Structures are given as C-alpha cells and as structure tokens.
Amino acid sequence: AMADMKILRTLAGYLWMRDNPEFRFRVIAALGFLVGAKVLNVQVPFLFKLAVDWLASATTNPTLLTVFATPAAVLIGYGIARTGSSAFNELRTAVFSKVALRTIRSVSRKVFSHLHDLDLRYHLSRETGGLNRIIDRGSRAINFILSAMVFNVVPTILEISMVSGILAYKFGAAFAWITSLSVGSYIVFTLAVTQWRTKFRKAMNKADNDASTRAIDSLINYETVKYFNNEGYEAEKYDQFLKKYEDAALQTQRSLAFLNFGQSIIFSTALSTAMVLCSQGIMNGQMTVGDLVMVNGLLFQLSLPLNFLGSVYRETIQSLVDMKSMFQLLEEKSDITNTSDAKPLVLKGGNIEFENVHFSYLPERKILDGISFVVPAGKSVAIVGTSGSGKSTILRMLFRFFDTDSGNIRIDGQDIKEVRLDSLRSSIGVVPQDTVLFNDTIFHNIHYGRLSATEEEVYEAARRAAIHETISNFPDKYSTIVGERGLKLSGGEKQRVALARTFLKSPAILLCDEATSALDSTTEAEILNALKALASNRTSIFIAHRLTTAMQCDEIVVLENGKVVEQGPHDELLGKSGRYAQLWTQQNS
Amino acid sequence: AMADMKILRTLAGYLWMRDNPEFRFRVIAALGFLVGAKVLNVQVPFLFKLAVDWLASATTNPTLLTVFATPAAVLIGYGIARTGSSAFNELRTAVFSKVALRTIRSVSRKVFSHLHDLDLRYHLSRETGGLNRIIDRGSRAINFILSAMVFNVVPTILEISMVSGILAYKFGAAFAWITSLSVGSYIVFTLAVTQWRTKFRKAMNKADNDASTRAIDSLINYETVKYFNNEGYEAEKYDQFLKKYEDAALQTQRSLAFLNFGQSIIFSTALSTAMVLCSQGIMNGQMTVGDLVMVNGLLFQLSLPLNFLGSVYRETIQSLVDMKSMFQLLEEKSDITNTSDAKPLVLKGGNIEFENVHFSYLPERKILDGISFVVPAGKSVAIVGTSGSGKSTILRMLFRFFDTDSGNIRIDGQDIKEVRLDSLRSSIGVVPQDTVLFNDTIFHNIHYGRLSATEEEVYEAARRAAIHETISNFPDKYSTIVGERGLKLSGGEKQRVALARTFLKSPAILLCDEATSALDSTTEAEILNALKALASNRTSIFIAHRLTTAMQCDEIVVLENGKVVEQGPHDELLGKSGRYAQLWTQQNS
Ligand SMILES: Nc1ncnc2c1ncn2[C@@H]1O[C@H](COP(=O)(O)OP(=O)(O)O)[C@@H](O)[C@H]1O
Ligand SMILES: Nc1ncnc2c1ncn2[C@@H]1O[C@H](COP(=O)(O)OP(=O)(O)O)[C@@H](O)[C@H]1O
Ligand code: VO4
Ligand code: VO4
Ligand SMILES: [Mg+2]
Ligand SMILES: [Mg+2]
Numbered sequence A, B: 001a002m003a004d005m006k007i008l009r010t011l012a013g014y015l016w017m018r019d020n021p022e023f024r025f026r027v028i029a030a031l032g033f034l035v036g037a038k039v040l041n042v043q044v045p046f047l048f049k050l051a052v053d054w055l056a057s058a059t060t061n062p063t064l065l066t067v068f069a070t071p072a073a074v075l076i077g078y079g080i081a082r083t084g085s086s087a088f089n090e091l092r093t094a095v096f097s098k099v100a101l102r103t104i105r106s107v108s109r110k111v112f113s114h115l116h117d118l119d120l121r122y123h124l125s126r127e128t129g130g131l132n133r134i135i136d137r138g139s140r141a142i143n144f145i146l147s148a149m150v151f152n153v154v155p156t157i158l159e160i161s162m163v164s165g166i167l168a169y170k171f172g173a174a175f176a177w178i179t180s181l182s183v184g185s186y187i188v189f190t191l192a193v194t195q196w197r198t199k200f201r202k203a204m205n206k207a208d209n210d211a212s213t214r215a216i217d218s219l220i221n222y223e224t225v226k227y228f229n230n231e232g233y234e235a236e237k238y239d240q241f242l243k244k245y246e247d248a249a250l251q252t253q254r255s256l257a258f259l260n261f262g263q264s265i266i267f268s269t270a271l272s273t274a275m276v277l278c279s280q281g282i283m284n285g286q287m288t289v290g291d292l293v294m295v296n297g298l299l300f301q302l303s304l305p306l307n308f309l310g311s312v313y314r315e316t317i318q319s320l321v322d323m324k325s326m327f328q329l330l331e332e333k334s335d336i337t338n339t340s341d342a343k344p345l346v347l348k349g350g351n352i353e354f355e356n357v358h359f360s361y362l363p364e365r366k367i368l369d370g371i372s373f374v375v376p377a378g379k380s381v382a383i384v385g386t387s388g389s390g391k392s393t394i395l396r397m398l399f400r401f402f403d404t405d406s407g408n409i410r411i412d413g414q415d416i417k418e419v420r421l422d423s424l425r426s427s428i429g430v431v432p433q434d435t436v437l438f439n440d441t442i443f444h445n446i447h448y449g450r451l452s453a454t455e456e457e458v459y460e461a462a463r464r465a466a467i468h469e470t471i472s473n474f475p476d477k478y479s480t481i482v483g484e485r486g487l488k489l490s491g492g493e494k495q496r497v498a499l500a501r502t503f504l505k506s507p508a509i510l511l512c513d514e515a516t517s518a519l520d521s522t523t524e525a526e527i528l529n530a531l532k533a534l535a536s537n538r539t540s541i542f543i544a545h546r547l548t549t550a551m552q553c554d555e556i557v558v559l560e561n562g563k564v565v566e567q568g569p570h571d572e573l574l575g576k577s578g579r580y581a582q583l584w585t586q587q588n589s
Helices: A002-015 A021-058 A071-115 A120-126 A131-169 A175-220 A222-228 A231-280 A291-301 A304-311 A313-331 A421-425 A442-447 A455-464 A491-505 A521-533 A570-575 A579-588 B002-015 B021-058 B071-115 B120-126 B131-169 B175-220 B222-228 B231-280 B291-301 B304-311 B313-331 B421-425 B442-447 B455-464 B491-505 B521-533 B570-575 B579-588
Strands: A352-359 A380-384 A406-411 A428-431 A509-512 A539-543 A555-560 A563-568 B352-359 B380-384 B406-411 B428-431 B509-512 B539-543 B555-560 B563-568
Touching: A002 A071, A002 A313, A021 A071, A021 A131, A021 A291, A071 A131, A071 A313, A071 B175, A071 B231, A131 A175, A131 A291, A131 A304, A131 A313, A131 B131, A131 B175, A175 A222, A175 A231, A175 A291, A175 A313, A175 B071, A175 B131, A231 A291, A231 A304, A231 A313, A231 B071, A304 A313, A304 B304, A428 A491, A442 A455, A442 A491, A455 A491, A521 B579, A555 A579, A563 A570, A563 A579, A570 A579, A579 B521, B002 B071, B002 B313, B021 B071, B021 B131, B021 B291, B071 B131, B071 B313, B131 B175, B131 B291, B131 B304, B131 B313, B175 B222, B175 B231, B175 B291, B175 B313, B231 B291, B231 B304, B231 B313, B304 B313, B428 B491, B442 B455, B442 B491, B455 B491, B555 B579, B563 B570, B563 B579, B570 B579
Parallel strands: A380 A539, A380 A555, A428 A509, A509 A539, B380 B539, B380 B555, B428 B509, B509 B539
Antiparallel strands: A352 A406, A555 A563, B352 B406, B555 B563
C-alpha cells in the first residue's frame, strides 16, 4: 500500500547517507558477496552433472573442460562449492551488520529526540504506559526485518532469475512458464491470506496491548492494591484480557497454518510438473544425462527460501504492524510551535500582565472566564482561594505548556507568543505540582539545577534550603539512591529537593506551585526567610492557600471558579470581609 | 547446566497436567503426526530410486513391488510424498498450538499472581522500571522457544535415527560412523562457541537493559526535563548507552557469524565424505543404482534442520537468557510470611499499644529508638512534629509492610505477628502517602473501596467527602478518564478521591497519612466535621503537623529523631512550652 511505500522510503532514507562513500562501498561489497554466493550455489548442481554422466559413461570424454581423471576430485570440488557458498554468505552478514546497527542507533536516536518535543496534551493523558513497550518492540523489529529483507528475500528473486536463465540449454523452454505461474499464484494466495489474517489480527494486537497496560498500571499502583486487599480483582481482569488474547491467537494460528499447506502443495506440483515434462521426452535431451538432478536441485535451491517464507511469516505479520505503529509515532504535530519570526527576549525587569485571558482544557467546559492583573517588577504576588479554581493552570501558561484561547500575555512589554521558547523557558523557574525525581543520586538530582555548576555551589545550595542538618545524618553522604520516583525519601525531603533545584538555577522569574506543603512551622518559616533574602529574583509568584505563607507577599489575588474576584494587600483585604477574610479567620482560629 | 535442568523440569511440569487425559491425547496425536511426516520424508528419496534405476534399465523388472507401467506415476507419487509430508506437518502445529497457548496463559497467570505477593523492600527500591519489559519479553520468548523446541529440534534426532537406520542395506556401514563423528564434533564446537558468546554477551544484555531504564525514567519525569530545558542531556546519555550496546552487539555479531561457517564446512565434508566412499566402490553396490541420489537426498534432509540451527541461533542465545531471568523471578522469598499457626483476629474494641519498638530501614542507621504508647478504644490520637522523624513509618508497620527489629505490637490484646494478614489488613484502612489512581473512570476509582458496593453507596460516599458540588460541574458525570496517575485531576480532587475510597470501605481502624494537605480552610473544616460524625470508627490515627487539624484529636504525640518526646492533651501541652508549643505559636502567628 501507500503507507508501506512511505515506510520503505523513510527506511531507505535513514539507511542511505551520502556523506560517507564508505557506506556505499560496504553496500556494494555486500551485493558482490551475495552475487558470488548465489552464482556458486547455481554452479553446484551444474558441476554435479559431470559426475553423474561420467559414471553413466563408465556404466571417451567429448568435453575438454574436464581436467581430472577420477570423479572423486569432482566430488571434492562439489563439496568445495557449498564451502565457498557459505564463505561468501559468511562475509555478507559481517559487512551489513555494522550498517544495520548504525540504522538501529539512528532510528532510536531520532525517536527519543522526537518524543520529548510533544506537548502535555499528549504526554499527560494519551500517554498509556507502554510507549516504552512500543519503542522496545519496534527497535527489535527493525533489525530483524531489515536483516531478513536483505539476507533471504533479495537473493530469492535472483535465484528465480537464474532458474529462468537455465532456458539457454533448451530445457526450461516451458519450465520458465510453469515457474512464473507458480510464483504469481503463490504471491496472489499469500497476499489474499495476508489481508484476511490482518483483518483477523487487528483484534489480536488491540487485545494484547490492553493487557500489558493493565499489568503496568497494577505494578505502578501496588500500594493501593496492598492497602485494599483486592489482588484477586486485578488477577481476574488480567485473566479476562489474557483469555481474549488467547482466543484471538488461537483463531488466527490455525488460519496462519493453512498458508504453509497451500505454499507447499503449489511448489510441490511445480517440481512435480518439472518431473512430468522431463519424463515425457524419452529422447536424449532430458534422459539420464544429469538434467533430472539439476531440475531436482536447481528448483530446490529456489525452495530453500520456501523454508524461510513459511516459517518467518508469523513474525512478519506481527513485527511489521509494530513497525508502522512506531513509525507513526514520528509524524505527530507539536501543538505549541514557535512563531516564524522567533526573537529572543531580554528583560530589564520582570513585569507580567494579563489581558483578559480565556482558557479551556476541553472545548465544552471553560474553567476560567476572564483574568486580568499586573505583576509589578521588584515585587511578588500570592494566589489564594478555594480549590478547583485552576490556580495551578494560571502558572501552566506562563511556561507555554498550552496556548490560551482568547487573551494576551505580556512580560516586560513583550509578547509571550512572539518571543522564543528557549529564551522564555530558561529564564523562568518552577517547582512542580507533584515532585518527581530521577533514578540517580540525591547529589545528581540536586545538581540538575545547572548541569555546569560546581560541588560547592551544590553544597551552598543545600545550606539555603537548610537540608545539611538532615544531610549530616545521612547513611551515605550525597549518594543515597532515591528509587523510582523519590519514594525512598520522605515528603519533606522530596519537596526540599525540588526547591534546591530551583535555587541552583536561580532563574529570573520564580514560579512556586507548592510551598510548605509538607513542612513543619519551624522549617517553613526558615525557608520563607531564606527565600526572601536570597533565591528569589525581583519577580516571583506563589500559589499557596496557607495563610501564613502568603503574609509576606505584596499582592494577594483570590480565584474562584475562574474569575479573579478580590484583590489587594493583606491589611485592607482582611477588612473587606471577602473570601480571604473567611479563609484567614478559620486557619487563624 | 543444572539451572537449565531446573528450567526444563519447571516447564515440563507446567506443560504436563494430569487432570485432563485429553491433553495427553493431543500430545500423542502430535507425536504420531510428527512420526508419520518424518517417515514420509525418509520415504521420498527411497521411492525416487525406482524412477532412476528404471530409466537406467530403459537406457525386465526384478522387483514385483512396482505396480506401474510408466515412471510418470512414480513421479506423481514422488510429488505426493512431499504433499503428504506437509499435510502431516500441517496437523502437528494445529494440535500443539492450543496447548502452547495454554502454557503461555498459565505461566503469565502465575507470574502476575506472584509479583504482588512480594514486599515493599522489593517493590519500592529494587523495582527498576522494566519488570514489565522482562515479563513481556519472556512471555514472547516462551512461545517461540517451545514452538522451536518441538517443531524442528525434536525431529532432527529422529531423522538422524533413520539415516543411521539406512545401514540395513550394507551402505551406511561406515556412514553411521562419519555421521556420528560429524554430529559430535558439531555439538562440541557449537557448545564451545556458545559458552564463549555467552561470556561476551553478558555485557551486551547488561548494557541493553540500562538504556531502556533510562528511557522509561525520562518518559516518567517528562515535566522536569521540560521545566529545565535539559533534553540534550538525556539525549547524550541515551546516546552513550546505545553506543555501548552498539559496540557489544557488533563484537558479538561477527563472532556469532563464525559458527555458521564452521557448521557448514563440517557437514559439507560429511556429504563430501559420503560422496568419496560412494565413489570408491566402482562395483554395483553403490554405482548408478540410485544410492547416490538418496545419499545426496537423505543426508540433505538431515541438512534441512541445519538451516534452522544456524539461522535461529541469534535469538536462542538471547531469548533463553531472558527465559532464565523471568523464571528467576518466580523464586524470590516473601519477606513477610505469616506464622504457621495463623489465626484470625476478632476485636471487641480497637486498642493499640506499642511495647518498645525499634526499627531500622537499613541495618546501619536506626531511625527510631524506642516507641511506647497506648491508643484507647473509642478515642483517637494525632502525631505531630518536625519532618524526617519517621511519622509515616509508624503507620507503615501496623499494616505489616515491614517487620520491627525489637518490639511488640498489640491490637485489642492480640499479637500482630501472630494474627492472620488477611484479617489484619482487611480490618484497617489507610490513605496513601502520595495518592495513586488507576487508568479508569473516577467512578471506578471511587468504587474501589468495596468492589461489591452499589451506586447509591458510592453517590452517598461522595456526599460525605463533599465532592458532588464539584461533580455537578463535571463535563462527563462520573466518567472523566483520570489519566495515568490521576494527573488530569487537581491536587484537592486527587486527595479527595482517596478519602472517599477509605470511607466506602469504612474500616474498623482509620489510618490517615495526609489530611488536608492541599485543601482550603473551608473544605478541610467541613471534611473534619464530616469525618467525626461518620466515616470514623472508634479507633483512628492522624499524622498531620498542621495544628488546626490536630485540635480535635484526643491525644497528641510529638516525634523527633525517632524518640516519642512529649505527650498529652492540647490544653496541657500548650502550657508545657515543649516542641508542640513552639510549633503552634508559629502557625497561629
Ligand atoms: N489535564 C486536564 N484535563 C481536564 N481538566 C483539567 C486538566 N487539568 C486540570 N483540569 C481542571 O482544572 C481544574 C483545576 O486546575 P488546576 O490549576 O490544575 O488545579 P488547582 O486549581 O487545584 O491548582 C480542575 O477542576 C480540573 O477539572
Ligand atoms: N525506603 C526507604 N529507604 C531508606 N530510608 C527510608 C525509606 N523510607 C523512609 N526512610 C527514612 O525515614 C525517614 C522518614 O520516614 P517517613 O515516615 O517515611 O517520612 P516522614 O517522617 O516524613 O513521615 C527519612 O529520614 C528517610 O531517610
Ligand atoms: O487543589 V489547589 O486549587 O489548593 O492546587
Ligand atoms: O515530611 V513529614 O515527617 O510532615 O510526613
Ligand atoms: Mg513524610
Ligand atoms: Mg491543584
């Protein structure tokens, strides 16, 4: 199909690079080795003919091409024929393997580079645990398929060419017709069975992927199932999915088998018809002069790839589907594309203004209806209010994760839409909604703030976050492995790692999502004071509905149902008897 | 080796079940089909002999076994020979495929059932993202290997048996010796190359697994890399790992190739030696009576599996290693094993006492040094203090996730060590440290409290958690997909889902890890009041260093560095000027 053509074109483009002529040299050498090996294979039965007819003569020598006396040397060379055939087949794989592995490396490189380019609207909801499975299966699929494609499929047509070349001796005058008819009928039957089996297999792969997703989700949420003693429930669900895959595979496997019977009988008759015509001519052309052996031989060397084609068909219908799935991954469109006239941003001072911004995560429901406020340079603002009002969304747009529906965003009198992403993102620092850590050292995960920083910068950074007091009690200094998702550490430790990451970068704009979420009063008061003198540039935004941590901020904004309701400093805001007054009089108690 | 023997024994035990004699019937039928097909294959060249010698006679008939006139019918039956060989080979796969898929289902069943049985000390730190990869690769490995094992390896020895049976005609009197020598030398060479390549491949698989782990960790922490603009860093690290795997594969692949040359030359000489001895006897025994054709034929049918053995060797050395890795997963020991005299627990009232408990997560560092307190039945306790004092550990032991080093745990005058796990775990309910949700509906994830509950119980449960107010604003009622880890919801929503899960179960013992972590003052005050009248049995434990949420609890305990320092009710505790007084006077401000 056209999709297969595009896949082949992309594969050929990735394989063939014009920078290095040494690659073309390798390809030409591999082709030469293939041609030599197949020529030797065709030569084998032809040279075996002289042994047979010489024995028939023994039962003079018209041909002078013979330089021997006893046919034993002929049989020695007959063995040497397959020896050399293997030898030339040997060197072909060695040359092609390097370029095959280079292609694998380049493809995996491109896929990994491309995946992080996509948007949160993909990676947040349409990331079903198993993109790793797709990449792993496809990467293994590519090497197998291209290794299969060159090593056995390509030489088969060339052997067909030589068996169609055997007509020069007046033998194959019809054998060419029979072989062409058999090949065409076999190809038609194979494609018909293949389309039918793809029709019956589309349900198989769909069922298979869901079971792995269920298993990976069960592994990820192991704590909950251990809490609620419901292991049998995931057990039964995985059983049902596996039974569905069982039925799908069993139905297909019997039908996949039937092709092997069809392939064998068609080509058995092809050899049978070759026997019949050879039997018809009782005259000397095709009786007892060896041509029966080559016809048994040469058309059987065409039957050598028959063993591959029937046997490897099970994975061909499976891996190629996974190939298209993984290649389909390299055609998605980045939702957030920078403007054509991309221009870097330079700020004399961080001033942020909203001009009636509207955003909806889904088109039907609009979370926020009108937001307009200004962030003075040299000061800071706090965002407090009831939950569910999208107050972490308001800081998910300044980083251009999503694009607003109808509104304007201004930083230092510059358009966020117009400015470059790299200048935008590297100038503003954030602490995430739920802290996530790498599977490496705590020192590496705290040094991630600026990858070119020094150890003393890291050590002084931990002093600002006041974690050396806990560090001195470490069992391993700056080397405790923190697990898969920072689980090994505590809540306060996980939250204090992210803050140190932000301070190490020391960005121009601060963006705090959770401050003092899981910290005691003494630590949080120290962090806030440590976050005022240092670690905070002249612009910073806090979203924290704890009242004591929004005391220090210059401006307080109240968000309810997406409308920015009440504004003002703390002293006036308490006397207004607004939502802020209700919230504060409760926490103060 | 012995490990291979144990793997084979386990595989045979899983495959062979004695409950159903129909399985034994299927196995016997498959063996009969195999024997018939191979007998037909051996018959092919033997019946082809009569065609050759009859033509030599044409160049009377001593044997009366012939019932034909023209050799065309002999050639028709000659084609029918491979037709029937394929036909019997056809039915063998159909019968064996069902039991193969049943074995796959049972093995995956057992692995999934066994994985959730292990402990947190495994699933929390030694779970490197990729257990799913191991299971997926092994499950695919089993079907391929056992499909290969029966279909081609087993018939090869049987063809060796018949080619050693051809001696009855005084032909193979030495051919048996040559074939046995060739087989033995080939096996010795194959095992030597295989052990060398396993030595060179142990580094390959080790390098391969690390790259996939890096990729999966990068995918999991996508938000952090997007925050910090360090995509090139993971790019370079994945490049380095892929280069290491590249070198490991390239070094092995050239050496893996060399075996194919060695296998071919040894068996080419075996056929060559068969030619030589046949050439020595110019007398009628082995000249121009067809035996050259069978010797070319019969020993080549032994060379039919040669094509498999060389070609499929690449995955045999790979999948079998993955087989052992996945089977090694079903031998780990559960760290927490219930006592032999397992007895269910029945509580008249929840009374919890600690008797000088000591626990260390790692042997070197002891987090807590002596904990002893009593939980009165009908009342509740609050655990407040500075972070890092293991206050979520103190509730990770009542659920018997780990075992204490030196101490006693008592519930209603019963030993936690002695009582049964299922009675223990199903009687106490907990809310997790970091909320984790399934990849299903919000209704399913809130109904997970009691899987046999009704919708009205779920709907009234959401009323207790006061989430219908947000539910009425849902875009889809009780059906919004919540993503991979509940990411699509907000923090307050994620925390309020877990609480509803706990209330739906309505356990005998309440165990709250984070209460009002990401909730405003108005919601938290409502939840606490909604958690006093209902949803709380007579025993409950709160760990929350927020002062306003520990006001209602009867008893307050202060934990610092693992020592339970200060105890007492709120009114007396404030006047003691302890750590609690310092913490409260700050939050109150
Ligand atoms: N990925 C998403 N898909 C659909 N709705 C979302 C998504 N992320 C957030 N929301 C909606 O936004 C509201 C709150 O947004 P957010 O700022 O993320 O949480 P919070 O307001 O607690 O900070 C919620 O009511 C939720 O329905
Ligand atoms: N899996 C683990 N491996 C090593 N140490 C741990 C692990 N889990 C917890 N700890 C240690 O326990 C202390 C706090 O325990 P925990 O109760 O989990 O957190 P918190 O005290 O914040 O509730 C931390 O100092 C941490 O070093
Ligand atoms: O659930 V919140 O609106 O406090 O991020
Ligand atoms: O970091 V904590 O000791 O408040 O769970
Ligand atoms: Mg904690
Ligand atoms: Mg939130």
